[model samples]
Target: STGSATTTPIDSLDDAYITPVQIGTPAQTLNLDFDTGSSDLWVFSSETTASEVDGQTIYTPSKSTTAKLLSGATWSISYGDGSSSSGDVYTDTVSVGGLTVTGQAVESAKKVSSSFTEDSTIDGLLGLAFSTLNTVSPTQQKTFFDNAKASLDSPVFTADLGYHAPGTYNFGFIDTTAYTGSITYTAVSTKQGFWEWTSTGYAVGSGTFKSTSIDGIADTGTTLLYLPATVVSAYWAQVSGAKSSSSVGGYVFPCSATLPSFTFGVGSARIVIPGDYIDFGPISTGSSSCFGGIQSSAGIGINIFGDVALKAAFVVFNGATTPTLGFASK
Candidate 1:
């Protein structure tokens, strides 16, 4: 079986992408962030405290005949950004695009952090990462991708995240027409339950490629590109007015600065991200200084190739028994 869904950026900075998902017998549609960094298909629901529910669409299990509570199953998770959610579990008929899964685990939130409550664009998260990362206690549940992969033709999914526009998430097969050039594949280590891989190297605009093994995860949930302090500093050094500021956090530069493009290697492939893509946005409303899309990952423990980097290429999250990652230019 194959499925295709549209993913749209929620904010001007392309901070996160959300896609519609169908849950319950009547197919309650909720917009969810398809996150590759975590494994938990959680959602805002009727069980959530009324004060915690803002503009998000909530899933009411009582209304769906197919929804069955998973007795004693509860889950909680805190993200790297400090946002978190805790909930009980249910098994329901869930569908994405045209792919349907019966008895799929659906976590209904009872409480959510302020950040999630304030972000009305996303109703929940549909994890694409390995099921090993699932947080459900007693019996960890499989992710939407993991449960549906057996029925898929190729057991793979691809993310075509866009900049300021709608993109696509395809399951079962790679869309040859979606990108150009041969896809470069890299070995993925699932030890950490992430789409983790070692990038061959990187290069600043017009500069020679600096060969170095950079290990990182391809995370769709994160908003920016975080690399080693050395690489981040090297890139910002070229910009005239760029500097690391404690006030704004990370690097920032004049809005009018001439930013240089960045290129990262995936095996023999070199995907170039345009300079304009690095200008995340102004630090604040109407500010002349803008935040850099690329920042230091020193404090983050691991490098993260977030939406800022993913939007620059066509990324394949291969879910085969021997998982691998593929990258190609669009």
Candidate 2:
């Protein structure tokens, strides 16, 4: 269930993604989304009065002697889904697998949405993305990975998503055993602070659909791949019964049958998206028809390859010595 490898520090914490640290002395399992886009590691607290905290596991500072609190510090975060959380700052000795990061800063949310607060499976989120957007500093500086990098087995990091779970994001060390040879690396742009790239085009089944190439960004923070109208339309044309049902979201198709297998060629790597991801759920507008695979983001200038796309491959962000990205099979 666990793979390992080494990684380098690229930019500031402001540009990296962080993974979750399990809590407790002997330790309990908890996998969190470490985001650099935003700061603050807030887990649902047992003391929280809100009903949203019903199922979420709260890390008790009392349980771990290494846990500490940053006096008077507080934080709040809101997502594209309109969900939000507010919490206090705290610190503790966080552990990820066999790696242990001491004196790690975290947030204890007093208020959270039902979606996040009610999830008992995941303990909380670890904001490892970057310090540029971080809320805790001075009193609490450096992320778990930033401090633990020097002591790791390798100075490289890799994340494989599809193997274990849908959102299974790992950090700290890179597992070279998962890859065969050297990975193709791409440099990061200093301007946007995100790992940006260009895609040759997309493929459905065995057919290759060639259109205008797309310049885009790879973001774990986002949930889906936001493609342009022309690309979305062209892709759906290949899928049977795929149609544009709503103007607000992506293209929707009936879920009665299997979806066409798809892949996106980004440089030397080909990212695959499974059919189940397309048949996610039933659309409220029409229960008879289910939502399709592709979404339409015509006006949106930036196209983002989110967790859904990321899960299909092994992603490496080379930020330490050189600003680059390495991709391989998951």
Candidate 1 local lDDT, 64-160, one digit each (tens): 9999999999999999899999999999999999999999999999999999999999999999889999999999999999999899999999999
lDDT of each: 0.94, 0.61
Model 1 residue 291 CA deviation in Å? 0.6
- Predicted candidate 2 versus true structure: per-residue lDDT over 82-138, tens digit per residue: 777877877776776557776677677787877666445555666545444555534
Give the residue spans of candidate 1 off by over 4 A.
none
Clashes of 1: 0
TM-score of every candidate relative to the true structure: 0.99, 0.80
**The candidate that achieves the highest lDDT relative to the unseen native structure:** 1
